[PDB]
Design a protein around this ligand. Structure first.
Ligand SMILES: [Cu+]
Ligand SMILES: [Cu+]
Ligand SMILES: [Cu+]
Ligand SMILES: [Cu+]
Ligand SMILES: [Cu+]
Ligand SMILES: [Cu+]
Ligand SMILES: [Cu+]
Ligand SMILES: [Cu+]
Ligand SMILES: [Cu+]
Ligand SMILES: [Cu+]
Ligand SMILES: [Cu+]
Ligand SMILES: [Cu+]
Ligand SMILES: [Cu+]
Ligand SMILES: [Cu+]
Ligand SMILES: [Cu+]
Ligand SMILES: [Cu+]
Ligand SMILES: [Cu+]
Ligand SMILES: [Cu+]
Ligand SMILES: [Cu+]
Ligand SMILES: [Cu+]
Ligand SMILES: [Cu+]
Ligand SMILES: [Cu+]
Ligand SMILES: [Cu+]
Ligand SMILES: [Cu+]
Ligand SMILES: [Cu+]
Ligand SMILES: [Cu+]
Ligand SMILES: [Cu+]
Ligand SMILES: [Cu+]
Ligand SMILES: [Cu+]
Ligand SMILES: [Cu+]
Ligand SMILES: [Cu+]
Ligand SMILES: [Cu+]
Ligand SMILES: [Cu+]
Ligand SMILES: [Cu+]
Ligand SMILES: [Cu+]
Ligand SMILES: [Cu+]
Ligand SMILES: [Cu+]
Ligand SMILES: [Cu+]
Ligand SMILES: [Cu+]
Ligand SMILES: [Cu+]
Ligand SMILES: [Cu+]
Ligand SMILES: [Cu+]
Ligand SMILES: [Cu+]
Ligand SMILES: [Cu+]
Ligand SMILES: [Cu+]
Ligand SMILES: [Cu+]
Ligand SMILES: [Cu+]
Ligand SMILES: [Cu+]
Ligand SMILES: [Cu+]
Ligand SMILES: [Cu+]
Ligand SMILES: [Cu+]
Ligand SMILES: [Cu+]
Ligand SMILES: [Cu+]
Ligand SMILES: [Cu+]
Ligand SMILES: [Cu+]
Ligand SMILES: [Cu+]
Ligand SMILES: [Cu+]
Ligand SMILES: [Cu+]
Ligand SMILES: [Cu+]
Ligand SMILES: [Cu+]
Ligand code: NA
Ligand code: NA
Ligand code: NA
Ligand code: NA
Lengths: 125, 125, 125, 125
């Protein structure tokens, strides 16, 4: 990623923010991937809620990552958006974690959602 | 839109929700349009904050509209996402409203953001 | 929608373009809805390809709608993006149509994708 | 990113594809950042076309990255979407490159768009 390099060259120019943007995009891709993998499993009927939560988590994480990319002093929705993203990731983590013993893709995704949750919460500080 | 027709045919199947989805997509398109119009004005330097808020409002409104399209009994991020969208629209409305005397596009956008704010807040009930 | 009203107030200011933007957002919402409905069906394992195509069609249609909202004389990706959106909608229509006898949501979605395909192709002219 | 780890655990499971997904998300974030930086420059009126192209490139790159994340044998829009993304990045590169002597953020962005263009074109093979 080029998050850190772009922040330093912004004419209005933060480690917690860089980590948050990086994680949001990582987590968006991972959740989109996890949903698709779940859709290809024999046992897809057991993964409906997981697929749905991953789709919502991918959407929210892209939005949050985009918003945060534009947050390098003026009033912003950033802190509200990051709280919502943290809650989304917490929910998605919980469901992916439940399937992690059965599907390796869900273990990887649950780990990324946990990290993203932490990153987004830390950037609200 | 086909929001109402699709909700009624969902196997797990709400006027406030239909109005919220419709408005989110209307508002996303309107804000994207408003940002582009502002970017073409002689006086673009006065509209920087407006353009930035419109970009964030378009992103959040698409996300909210998508999430809400998937919310037709299971646990959801919906109510959190709709609160964030309502706050986003309130912020964007305020700035577009400030320019409404000068730019007709901003008057139209401020009106749509006001309506979307109301719709999203009403769907959290 | 406010597509037509916003185009007329753009400082750089087209019926085919308005219809294309409107349809892209309608189709994005419809496909997102169709995927979610398919995910809730008893027979979800038969709908894997449909769900996947709907997810891609929602993503492409939002992108196309956004791009087209910013296309009201300068060089643009618009015509390329609209060709891609037309191909996406054609593919998604074909698969939703295949399930239309079994699931009413897929009949509605197939009809919207057909219309969106036509609209996007007509706006490339 | 977790692109490579997720592809290997997909139940239907490609170096060119991994590089393409990674680059699309990098480029989406970079272009969103570049647009915001341009919007904060004294000389924003000279950067209108650059801002507009960056917004379109961010939208297309997210879409392409998402689609490609779901492309790990069945029929797909992938190759069409990647051609469109390659054309988008070529256009955005050209305009960012034109401003690269004046704005360091545009130099970084032009380099990322060039790389993403190459990656997306290589994944169509
Ligand atoms: Cu995230
Ligand atoms: Cu994620
Ligand atoms: Cu999954
Ligand atoms: Cu997730
Ligand atoms: Cu997420
Ligand atoms: Cu999150
Ligand atoms: Cu986040
Ligand atoms: Cu997540
Ligand atoms: Cu999850
Ligand atoms: Cu998974
Ligand atoms: Cu998962
Ligand atoms: Cu995850
Ligand atoms: Cu997950
Ligand atoms: Cu996440
Ligand atoms: Cu996060
Ligand atoms: Cu809205
Ligand atoms: Cu709006
Ligand atoms: Cu505007
Ligand atoms: Cu707005
Ligand atoms: Cu909005
Ligand atoms: Cu909103
Ligand atoms: Cu909303
Ligand atoms: Cu708004
Ligand atoms: Cu606004
Ligand atoms: Cu405006
Ligand atoms: Cu506005
Ligand atoms: Cu508005
Ligand atoms: Cu506005
Ligand atoms: Cu709004
Ligand atoms: Cu709303
Ligand atoms: Cu469409
Ligand atoms: Cu559609
Ligand atoms: Cu469906
Ligand atoms: Cu579709
Ligand atoms: Cu579509
Ligand atoms: Cu389309
Ligand atoms: Cu289209
Ligand atoms: Cu479609
Ligand atoms: Cu379809
Ligand atoms: Cu359907
Ligand atoms: Cu369908
Ligand atoms: Cu459809
Ligand atoms: Cu469909
Ligand atoms: Cu469509
Ligand atoms: Cu269309
Ligand atoms: Cu790209
Ligand atoms: Cu880019
Ligand atoms: Cu820039
Ligand atoms: Cu760009
Ligand atoms: Cu791009
Ligand atoms: Cu690209
Ligand atoms: Cu690309
Ligand atoms: Cu680019
Ligand atoms: Cu560019
Ligand atoms: Cu830049
Ligand atoms: Cu740039
Ligand atoms: Cu770039
Ligand atoms: Cu750029
Ligand atoms: Cu790019
Ligand atoms: Cu690329
Ligand atoms: Na900002
Ligand atoms: Na749902
Ligand atoms: Na334009
Ligand atoms: Na696929």
């Amino acid at each position: 990623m080029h998050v850190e390099a772009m922040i330093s060259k912004h004419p209005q120019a933060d480690r917690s923010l860089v980590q948050c943007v990086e994680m949001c995009f990582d987590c968006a891709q991972t959740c989109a991937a996890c949903a698709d993998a779940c859709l290809g499993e024999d046992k897809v009927a057991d993964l409906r809620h997981c697929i749905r939560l991953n789709l919502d988590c991918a959407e929210i994480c892209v939005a949050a990552g985009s918003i945060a990319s534009r947050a390098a002093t003026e009033e912003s929705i950033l802190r509200t958006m990051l709280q919502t993203c943290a809650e989304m990731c917490r929910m998605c983590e919980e469901e992916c974690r439940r399937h992690a013993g059965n599907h390796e893709h869900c273990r990887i995704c649950a780990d990324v959602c946990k990290e993203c949750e932490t990153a987004c919460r830390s950037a609200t500080g």
